[PDB]
From TrEMBL, chain D:
Subunit details: In plastids the minimal PEP RNA polymerase catalytic core is composed of four subunits: alpha, beta, beta', and beta''. When a (nuclear-encoded) sigma factor is associated with the core the holoenzyme is formed, which can initiate transcription.
Organism classification: Eukaryota, Viridiplantae, Streptophyta, Embryophyta, Tracheophyta
Protein's name in the database: DNA-directed RNA polymerase subunit beta''
Reported function: DNA-dependent RNA polymerase catalyzes the transcription of DNA into RNA using the four ribonucleoside triphosphates as substrates.
Included stretch of the parent chain: 3 to 50 of 1373
Subcellular location: Plastid, Chloroplast
UniProtKB/TrEMBL annotation, chain E:
The gene coding this protein: rpoA
Comment text on domains: The N-terminal domain is essential for RNAP assembly and basal transcription, whereas the C-terminal domain is involved in interaction with transcriptional regulators and with upstream promoter elements.
Function: DNA-dependent RNA polymerase catalyzes the transcription of DNA into RNA using the four ribonucleoside triphosphates as substrates.
Name listed for the protein in its UniProt record: DNA-directed RNA polymerase subunit alpha
Pfam family, one: RNA_pol_A_bac
Record domain DNA-directed RNA polymerase RpoA/D/Rpb3-type: where: 20-223
Assembly and oligomerization: In plastids the minimal PEP RNA polymerase catalytic core is composed of four subunits: alpha, beta, beta', and beta''. When a (nuclear-encoded) sigma factor is associated with the core the holoenzyme is formed, which can initiate transcription.
GO CC field: chloroplast; DNA-directed RNA polymerase complex
Length: 110, 63, 318, 48, 271
């Protein structure tokens, strides 16, 4: 079905270099990070709520540490909101953001 | 085991080893305790309850 | 290396179900040993969970006071034998166990089919004696709890005769306080000796009592009840900030503006002297500030008549 | 309001306490002394 | 259904040196409320740090009498007034406070020159009354200890008068248990009642007592670093009479008594 899918850095490049029809959500997580496990649970049901209208992808910063530094991921949990239209800019949220804010970030403002 | 005539085989209730046994041996302190042993009142611990130390069987006949 | 050290000065294994351990804690400043000793005394005696059989279920017997052919013990003798066995388990909940065997022979604790959660302590404990080749199967319930099982009727089930379980695993505890003879700060030496039924070693019981004690005094270090905002339904929020955020989004959608009980004087651009005096007077919220009077503000130490005038117009602009 | 009792300093016994209750009843009334007895009862039981 | 939470139900401040506070803890399982109440009461009464004056030096006063000119109060009464001063502090060790004052007037707690970390809870407390225009300098000794602790050193004897100061910041404490039943749901409610002398609020004393209690049981969880034949007697075994008498004199009757003390062994080892 639809859930948060584990992807690596090269699995995220073609995602952002290629076509994006629905908004792409990048979850920079680490297994040792406590709040990131909480951050996952919100994304578990956010994916259910938005189903195929949005895409959720998790990236492990322990393995993709060089890639996270390029993304300027200053800590965890960090979420990247990628607009389907390449013209618009991205949104980086740091900290355990609430579920409601993620709703308005992807439906509007992006 | 070999038994002489008149020796004990089984002991009934309130009898242990051929002796009358109507009670129990328990640790006891003779002190006043907040009035719960006022006059002839007795203060006991839960050990006597959950330990079945003073648990007795009673059979009632309805006819 | 630590200035305050503890050690197990003597550990003994008198029998399979009687472990003795003595522990020392030195040096303790005067009055600490008395406080630690009594709290450890009460925690060890009545704040340590144990697991044991709670009820047994036979098949073909009419009642727990009948006799089974081929068994040298009465059914009531079996229940007391079951009530005596010792089990260890770190998990809660009611679990099943089985003694489905056939004789003749001796039925011991080693013959009990136990779930992986629980473990048998003394496998040599006698349960029953079978004299003829009968097939005996007993259904067991294992539960971990505090204190002792309630000695009241609960046999409404399918003839599961209840067993008066005593969950307390610490048979006895004692502590002694000895003067360290320092002569400069009145240090003291604390000894703790623990007797356990083998379900946990005395060192484990010493740690478990300390951890259980901490969980009893740690609630006072939690935030006071009704401090954060809640929907007054869950009463237990992992993230205390979110329920208030859910209020603002609903508030913004309805455009009703935040209440005064949630507006703090920090946001009011007050002079630093005014802010410090209000905080000193335990006035933190705007609503609390409004409930006071001008006379109630003049009586404050570093508060003057001219200040209540400038304070009002600041509120007037808001 | 401070109560003008008397600081019994030497000892109290069965006769001494009986007199004190009599004086307390005749000065404060039975409602006060009924409460005083409960406090005295608790104090005696606690120290015993 | 509920979680273990605490709340302050009553809070009164009917003095500058008398604070009252009542706290509720619930729900509690059977038997836990008594354990918490007993330990918390012990922590509140003695385990909470208190600050008060311990010694008083009468500088520039060689009178050494019970009374001095210009002061109505006697020297002994001045010490008594000092002993009533309520202080709050976070000091470590010992500090010095000074009271140098003018002539006629009232010496209050406001007139005490304080070390940086200490405060006067009630500056209106009366120390002494001045009549004649004479200056008076008093050398105080501020110390912060627990109620249960004892101190033996008293500055020897250098005209400094010790003050037998009680270090209780919590004037009184009491706990009560309310038990509620719902047929089979026996939950207990613990009430904590704290009286403080204003040096700390009853809510603060509740936290300090809880923290002090926890700090007592933390050491039990500490771990340390790692580095890489009564029924046989000496009579039966053939022994020389010289050795036999020596053992018998020392009450060594059996062989166990022999091994518990440490050509005797050569003959013994074969049997």
């Amino acid at each position: 079905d639809y859930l948060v899918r584990k992807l690596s850095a090269q699995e995220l490049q073609d995602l952002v270099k290629g076509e994006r029809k629905v908004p792409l959500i990048v979850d920079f997580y680490a297994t040792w990070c406590g709040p990131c496990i909480l951050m996952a649970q919100e994304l578990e049901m956010l994916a259910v709520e938005y189903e195929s209208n949005a895409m959720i992808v998790k990236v492990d910063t322990d393995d993709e540490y060089e890639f996270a530094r390029d993304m300027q991921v200053r800590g965890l949990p960090t979420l990247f909101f990628i607009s389907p239209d390449p013209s618009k800019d991205a949104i980086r949220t740091e900290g355990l953001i609430p579920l409601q804010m993620m709703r308005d970030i992807i439906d509007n403002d992006m | 085991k070999c038994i002489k005539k008149g020796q004990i085989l089984a002991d009934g209730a309130a009898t242990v080893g051929g002796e009358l046994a109507l009670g129990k041996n328990i640790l006891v302190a003779y002190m006043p305790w907040e009035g719960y042993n006022f006059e002839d009142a007795v203060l006991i611990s839960e050990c006597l309850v959950y330990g079945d130390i003073y648990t007795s069987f009673h059979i009632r006949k309805y006819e | 290396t630590r200035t305050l050290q503890w050690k197990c000065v003597e550990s003994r294994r008198d029998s399979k179900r009687l472990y003795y351990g003595r522990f020392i804690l030195s040096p303790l400043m005067k009055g600490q040993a008395d406080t630690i000793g009594i709290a450890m005394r009460r925690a060890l005696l009545g704040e340590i969970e144990g697991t044991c059989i709670t009820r047994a279920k036979f098949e073909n017997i009419p009642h727990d006071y009948s006799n089974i052919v081929g068994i040298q013990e009465s059914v009531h003798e079996i229940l007391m034998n079951l009530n005596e066995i010792v089990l260890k388990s770190n998990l809660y909940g009611t679990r099943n166990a089985l003694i489905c065997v056939q004789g003749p022979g001796y039925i011991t604790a080693r013959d009990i089919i136990l779930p992986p959660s629980v473990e048998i302590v003394d496998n040599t404990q006698h349960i029953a004696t079978l004299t003829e080749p009968i097939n005996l199967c007993i259904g067991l319930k294992i539960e971990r709890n505090r204190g002792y099982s309630l000695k009241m009727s609960n046999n409404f089930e399918d003839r599961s005769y209840p067993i008066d379980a005593v969950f307390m695993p610490v048979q006895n505890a004692n502590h002694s306080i000895h003067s360290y003879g320092n002569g400069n700060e009145k240090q003291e030496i604390l000894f703790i000796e623990i007797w356990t039924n083998g379900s946990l070693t005395p060192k484990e019981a010493l740690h478990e009592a300390s951890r259980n004690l901490i969980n009893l005094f740690i609630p006072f270090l939690h935030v006071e009840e009704e401090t954060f905002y809640l929907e007054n339904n869950q009463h237990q929020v992992t993230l205390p900030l979110f329920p208030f955020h859910n209020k603002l989004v609903n508030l913004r959608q309805k455009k009703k503006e935040l209440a005064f009980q949630y507006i703090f004087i920090d946001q009011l651009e007050l002079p630093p002297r005014i802010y410090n005096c209000l905080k000193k007077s335990n006035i933190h919220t705007l609503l609390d500030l409004l409930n006071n009077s001008q006379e109630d503000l003049i009586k404050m130490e570093h508060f003057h008549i001219e200040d209540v005038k400038k304070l009002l117009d600041i509120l007037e602009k808001k | 309001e401070r109560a003008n009792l008397v600081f019994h300093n030497k000892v109290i016994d069965g006769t001494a306490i009986k007199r004190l209750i009599s004086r307390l009843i005749d000065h404060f009334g039975m409602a006060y002394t009924s409460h005083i007895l409960d406090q005295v009862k608790t104090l005696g039981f606690q120290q015993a």
